[PDB]
Amino acid sequence: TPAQSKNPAKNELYLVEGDSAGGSAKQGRDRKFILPLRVINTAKAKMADILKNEEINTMIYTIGAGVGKIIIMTDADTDGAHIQTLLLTFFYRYMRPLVEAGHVYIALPPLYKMSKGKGKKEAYAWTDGELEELKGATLQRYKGLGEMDQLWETTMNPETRTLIRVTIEDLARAERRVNVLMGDKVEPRRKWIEDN
Amino acid sequence: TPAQSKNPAKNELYLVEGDSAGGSAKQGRDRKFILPLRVINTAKAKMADILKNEEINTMIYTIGAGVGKIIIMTDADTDGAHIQTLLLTFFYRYMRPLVEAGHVYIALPPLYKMSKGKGKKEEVAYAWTDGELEELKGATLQRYKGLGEMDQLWETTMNPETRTLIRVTIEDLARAERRVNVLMGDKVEPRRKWIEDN
Amino acid sequence: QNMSLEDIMGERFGRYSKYIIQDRALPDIRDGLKPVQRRILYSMNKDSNDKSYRKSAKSVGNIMGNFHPHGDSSIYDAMVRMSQNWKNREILVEMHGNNGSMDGDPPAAMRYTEARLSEIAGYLLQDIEKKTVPFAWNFDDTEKEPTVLPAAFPNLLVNTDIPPHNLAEVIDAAVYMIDHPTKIDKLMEFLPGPDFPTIIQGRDEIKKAYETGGRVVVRSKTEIEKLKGGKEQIVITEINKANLVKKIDDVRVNNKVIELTELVLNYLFKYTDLQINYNFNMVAIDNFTPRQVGIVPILSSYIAHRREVILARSRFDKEKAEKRLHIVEGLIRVISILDEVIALIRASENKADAKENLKVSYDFTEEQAEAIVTLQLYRLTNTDVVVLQEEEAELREKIAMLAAIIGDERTMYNLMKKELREVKKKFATPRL
Amino acid sequence: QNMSLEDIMGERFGRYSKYIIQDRALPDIRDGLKPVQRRILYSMNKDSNTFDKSYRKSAKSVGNIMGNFHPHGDSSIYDAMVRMSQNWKNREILVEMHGNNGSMDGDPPAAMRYTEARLSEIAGYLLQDIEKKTVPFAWNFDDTEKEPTVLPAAFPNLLVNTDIPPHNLAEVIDAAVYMIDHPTAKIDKLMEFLPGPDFPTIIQGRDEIKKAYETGKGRVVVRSEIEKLKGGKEQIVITEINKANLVKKIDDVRVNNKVIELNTELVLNYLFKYTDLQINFNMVAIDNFTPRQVGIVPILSSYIAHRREVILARSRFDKEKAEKRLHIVEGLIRVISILDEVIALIRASENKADAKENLKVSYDFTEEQAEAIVTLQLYRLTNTDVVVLQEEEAELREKIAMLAAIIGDERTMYNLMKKELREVKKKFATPRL
DNA sequence: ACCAAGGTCATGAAT
DNA sequence: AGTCATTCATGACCTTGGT
DNA sequence: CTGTTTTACGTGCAT
DNA sequence: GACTATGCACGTAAAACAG
Ligand SMILES: N[C@@H]1CCN(c2c(F)cc3c(=O)c(C(=O)O)cn(C4CC4)c3c2Cl)C1
Ligand SMILES: N[C@@H]1CCN(c2c(F)cc3c(=O)c(C(=O)O)cn(C4CC4)c3c2Cl)C1
């Protein structure tokens, strides 16, 4: 199901959202020296439960390691978060070094884009402050890891906008990431949302 | 996958088009004293091929008989034809008596329907939107899209086939000749050729 | 380069914040709708859907591409729901064939279904017409969107879980609350409890629940009769007839306890889930944030928040009247000098030079001059000689009337009563 | 009751007729489009989605195609649509999408949830004159809107896209010209402009194409370089077929070794005709509102005559609209003369209706004459039109003569159609291949 | 085979 | 055109838990 | 192990 | 949001046919 490979030199194994993205990546692989993801909340069930998950297990299949540059592309979809959230938790509570090393991290998709001239052809990563640098012409807005050849504007350059994870985590953070994601016991979560 | 049953008294086993219809029938069974169909061209492959078809096979499962009132509802879709065509051919080249008896035949869906008065109900219906349609401005007309849309469903359902068709009636021989000129698919040359009355 | 790095103490806090604030698209205490609703009810409106049945793919499509980023069958799937009269009180959209069985009945894709907006349904969208509710931009920034329809029908307590009721109890109360703002004991008199489309035990319980924001009980519509030949026959006609139809037959497979003692039915009814139910955990979003409410808060926030809705109705409409009466009051006065102006405009030069040049003859305004300069040669019939005259006091009366609704705290309510009473008829839910 | 019965000698004849007449929704010799196309290209139009404007989603565009002009189900509709996105399947893509069109390889495109697209420039061509009563137009199925029965099409999409082999707008117009000014034309001289069909993705069978062009059927051939790899070895690899089964067919050859930067070049000759690495033209569609087989000369044939009725309609209306304009003008001018009397006449006249009638006097003006006068709107009582309108009488009158000329002149007519078709050969101007 | 902590299943709206 | 898996709470309803 | 008829595989637009 | 089968033709590139 992945998108082939080559040499274990710099590793490189990107995870995309939904067969559409992972399709747009696989055919657009302007940078594969891919694997669709349709992800359980690690800390949410039995370890046996978790191995029974095609999603978890798949990720364990590709690249061996086992419980003893792997980048993840989401979108912008607040829905696109929750899918960053689990991945990272599923790379934490399991495959600790993977991140602890920091070889495997999380991608920064694009946002607003400008384009003018009908038939005369002619991007940005924060449609907030960064957007102001860019009437007469025309603007845009990014819907998701959908839409986007282009695709390898985030693709071709070695992660022109990539994010390195876990950097100096440390302890007492495990405390928090099992306050939020995991899904403690209700009371904690309703409660972390006193800064929202 | 069928829609249950009861007593073998009057048989009764309707075949609808697509899980939507067969759904609209099954829940609307204002008349089940059902089975979705997603049908090969019988005379088109090996008899072994044919038994390998979930479609053919299913039909053979429900109601035993084997190669040794089962009504079929289509639509109006010219596409809805081709799906009458095979069924009948698949009830012919196999299960000859089934039709030859004539217990199992083919249904006549509705066409145009009139309805007026916003919130005052008052509807109608008709089976030929040609001549029959003229018997029906001020109000509003309609047109039937398929065995889709249609409670109502049992306007063709509840009454014992208020518009049903009895098949095969005095077929006879030399007709097998023709039904293996058209449907089966013959060898190209025959089919291009039956379409000299079209 | 390799861009920066960041804590997963960092990344998994800020991400999951985004996703939690998107847990604030829950049913507003006011509209009583969850956005992927509000959007769907308004896409239907905008498009004008009285009129004939519209397909789906088109109506969804349009919902799912001018007002809702997400994918399609989140959009429509939901839609359908609003078709199911055995899930809501007043279905906010009427489809036809095949909505869905009380039993496991997969409804048909957008390929087949066809539906359109419902009468009751209007209620809630019955005054977006003017600058009623407060209104924002699209996501594509293409059209603009309402942030919670203004809603006549208190869909919130008539449909975080909120138990069905009946427009009838709901308006009847709603009235009481108005003229008597400040006990839940007297207020339960109008709504003894929540109505389900498909008898409830737990009086004491509902009673406390209405302020507490609890657990009730639910019993099935099955009676008793005597079958032929001298035997028993006791059978049945927001639960699910799917797992109930089988739970009986399951009881019968083991015989460990239906026209086949009556104490046995009492034991089966509380075991086979044949009369389980229910829960009432009233909870939604108020003040643009998540809170739990009760029977009194709901009517509460809705009465005040509807109050701002009726007042806006005044704000504009009055605005539109004033604007009208000043064009009139203008247009009349014209008649006097109809002959001079019809001569003034001829000589004036270009169009622009003409309205200016209407400095003389009168002290008329731009908006004044406009209509005069666009008065279109037909209407040089002075039919308006006496008529317009009548207008000055016509549009002027409505001008006083609406402005009255703005100053009068007591008269305001009387409007909201007349109206709510009105739906209780037009719509008028039967009891249950 | 049990209603009537009927022969399966009876029922299976009349049913399968219906279904066979629905086998007559095949690509018209003219528009060069199959209905579930024509519908899709016009739904896009009606909705204003030209190359110009911004990308429209899908579900909405399909939705709208699939519910005001196409009964059938959704992904028949769009699925098709996509196709028109694939520039490696057509010559001039009639719709430009973005963001997973489809790989040369097994690449499932994404549902209507994701894709977004809009009409293409070239694409306009074919819809570039529905504007007026160009092509002949019918009702909806729902009888809601109305539909075109085959777009009028500048670009001969039929021979540039029952199977019909791609070509190039350039060969196709170049010929198309020849045919006009020289109707009766051998296929030998006409192949001079189109040596054969162009595929977006070199063909062998000269003799064969040559006969195929009149025969309406036949078989041609299709061919897919060499270099020396470092260290002294061989390196000969590749960059309307399918790169899906070709990419594997090589590797399959290599698994059995029974015959690629990897020692004779004759081996590649043997693999190229075995592995399908370098593996027809059966021209056939619908003419006169019925199914026939055509050739290279019939196609241009029916399209030249059937385009000819297209250019003549363009005249029919536009001229019609001019006349209508010049008579309102010719009216409105004449008004100026008695502007003072009429501006007095209309005042006293009573109701609006009584006013236009009452314009029996002062002039012998007509209803349509009277109308505009009575709706002339008080701004325009600026007599700016004093001299101007005067100029109009000969302006709109010139266009009136011009268009009527296109209607009488058989030779001048063609010259229009040449100028235009030449025009697309530029604007569009397909490179050779 | 007792009664108890654990494990499941269903439900809209999103992927 | 129905198939298939899960988040995200929150319950009442069915699994093992031990001897 | 040869050459033969028979068999399956693919492709757009529909269910 | 990608799985899964079929008609409809027309190619021809792969199984099975005999001793
Ligand atoms: N395994 C199964 C056999 C039945 N089936 C179906 C089915 F049942 C329904 C549809 C369908 O409604 C549809 C559309 O109009 O929206 C398009 N397609 C095709 C483009 C995919 C359908 C298919 Cl393949 C395949
Ligand atoms: N592991 C699982 C199997 C099920 N599933 C999917 C999936 F992949 C995508 C969608 C989907 O896009 C969608 C929509 O809004 O259009 C709606 N639904 C649900 C209403 C049916 C989806 C489902 Cl269930 C994948």
Q: Helix/strand/coil (H, E, C) string of B51-69?
A: HCCHHHHHHHHCCCCCCCC
Distance CA D13, CA D272 (A): 47
Which distant-in-sequence residues (6+ apart) come within 8 Å of C432 by Cβ?
C166, C195, C196, C197
Instruction: Return the number of other C-beta atoms located less than 10 Å from residue C353's C-beta.
Output: 12
Using CA atoms in the order C413, C418, C420, C421, what is the torsion angle rounded to 10 degrees?
130
Residue D126: both structure tokens together: 């074919």
Count Cβ neighbours within 10 Å for each residue of D26-48 and write b for 16 or more, e otherwise. ebbbbbbbbbbbbbbbbbbbebe
User: Is the backbone of residue C392 left (phi > 0), alpha (psi -120 to 50) or beta?
Assistant: alpha
Which distant-in-sequence residues (6+ apart) come within 8 Å of C79 by Cβ?
C40, C56, C59, C60, C63, C93, C115
Distance CA B166, CA B107 (A): 9
Q: At what angle do helices D169-181 and D296-337 cross, to 10 degrees?
A: 80
Sheet strands (E) in chain B: 15-17, 35-37, 106-107, 164-165
Using CA atoms in the order D62, D63, D64, D67, what is the torsion angle rounded to 10 degrees?
120
CA nearest to D303, candidates D319, D280, D286, D290: D286
Write down which chains contact chain B via at least 3 CB pairs under 8 A. Answer: C, D
User: Is the backbone of residue A147 left (phi > 0), alpha (psi -120 to 50) or beta?
Assistant: left
Who lines ligand 2 at CB under 6 A? A 38; C 71-74, 77; D 113
The DSSP code for D91 is: S
Which distant-in-sequence residues (6+ apart) come within 8 Å of D349 by Cβ?
C381, D355, D358
Residues in chain D: 433
The coordinates were experimentally obtained by X-ray
From the Cβ of B85, is strand H under 7 Å away?
yes
Which distant-in-sequence residues (6+ apart) come within 8 Å of B137 by Cβ?
none
Which distant-in-sequence residues (6+ apart) come within 8 Å of D149 by Cβ?
D38, D135, D136, D137, D138
Q: Cite the DSSP H helix spans in chain B.
A: 18-27, 47-51, 54-61, 78-90, 96-97, 176-179, 191-194
Ligand minimally distant from the alpha carbon of residue A58:
2
Ligand minimally distant from the alpha carbon of residue C77:
2
Among the CATH numbers 3.40.50.670, 3.60.21.10, 1.10.10.10, 3.40.640.10, which is that of A1-196?
Answer: 3.40.50.670
So where are chain A's domains? 1-196
The DSSP code for A102 is: I
Distance CA C115, CA A170 (A): 57
Distance CA C426, CA A65 (A): 68
Which distant-in-sequence residues (6+ apart) come within 8 Å of B99 by Cβ?
B88, B91, B92, B105, B167, B168, B171, D8
Distance CA C95, CA C78 (A): 13
Candidates A81, A167, A170; nearest CB to C5? A167
Distance CA C71, CA C65 (A): 9
Sheet strands (E) in D65-173: 95-98, 116-119, 137-139, 146-148
Question: What Å distances lie between residue C346 and C365, C371, D336, CA to CA?
Answer: 19, 16, 12
Q: Which of C53, C76, C112, C271 is catalytic?
A: C112
Instruction: Return the number of other C-beta atoms located less than 10 Å from residue D335's C-beta.
Output: 22
Q: Residue B37 — φ and ψ, nearest 5°? A: -130, 120
Q: Are A182 and A41 within 8 A, CB to CB?
A: yes
Residue A78: both structure tokens together: 């607040």
Reported resolution, Å: 4.0
Helix or strand or coil: residue D252? helix
Who lines ligand 1 at CB under 6 A? B 38; C 111; D 73-76, 79
Distance CA A12, CA A82 (A): 23
Q: Are D319 and D404 within 8 A, CB to CB?
A: yes
Q: Are D80 and D61 within 8 A, CB to CB?
A: no
Q: Point out the ligand 2 atom lying closest to the alpha carbon of residue A54.
A: 1
Write down all domains in chain C, each with its CATH number in brackets.
1-212+282-317+408-432 (3.90.199.10), 213-281 (3.30.1360.40), 318-407 (1.10.268.10)
SS3 content of chain A, % helix, strand, coil (to 5): 30, 5, 65
Instruction: Return the number of other C-beta atoms located less than 10 Å from residue C83's C-beta.
Output: 21
Q: Are A177 and C8 within 8 A, CB to CB?
A: yes
Residue C269: both structure tokens together: 């009814």
Distance CA D65, CA D40 (A): 6
Q: Chain D: give the shortest CA distance to residue C197, in Å.
A: 33
Q: Cite the DSSP H helix spans in C129-197.
A: 155-158, 167-179, 184-187
Q: Cite the DSSP H helix spans in D22-52.
A: 38-46
Classified by CATH at the fold level, domain B1-198 comes out as Rossmann fold (3.40.50)
The DSSP code for C146 is: E
Query: Long-range contacts of range C214-217, CB-CB < 8 Å, 24 or more positions apart?
Result: C214/C279, C214/C280, C214/C281, C215/C278, C215/C279, C215/C280, C216/C277, C216/C278, C216/C279, C216/C280, C217/C275, C217/C277, C217/C278
Q: Are C280 and C209 within 8 A, CB to CB?
A: yes
CA nearest to C90, candidates C19, C162, C154, C26: C154
Sheet strands (E) in A35-167: 35-37, 106-107, 162-163
Q: Cite the DSSP H helix spans in D109-242.
A: 121-126, 157-160, 169-181, 187-190, 206-215
On the CB side of D252, CA atoms within 13 Å amount to 11
Helix or strand or coil: residue C145? strand
Residue A35: both structure tokens together: 């694997």
Cα first-last separation, chain B = 39
Residue A121: both structure tokens together: 């052809």
- Cα torsion angle, D183, D184, D187, D192, sign: negative
Q: Cite the DSSP H helix spans in A111-185.
A: 174-177
**Residue B77 annotated as binding site:** yes
Q: Are D194 and D177 within 8 A, CB to CB?
A: no
Residue type for position C73: S
Q: Residue B98 — φ and ψ, nearest 5°? A: -35, -60
Q: Are C202 and C188 within 8 A, CB to CB?
A: no
Pairing status of strand B164-165 against strand B106-107 = antiparallel
Distance CA D81, CA D58 (A): 10
CA nearest to C416, candidates C316, C287, C309: C309
CA nearest to B39, candidates B65, B58, B67, B63: B58
Residue C236: both structure tokens together: 């049945």
From the Cβ of D412, is strand H under 7 Å away?
no
Q: Chain A: give the shortest CA distance to residue C79, in Å.
A: 20
CA nearest to A22, candidates D245, D108, D247: D108
Q: Are D146 and D117 within 8 A, CB to CB?
A: no
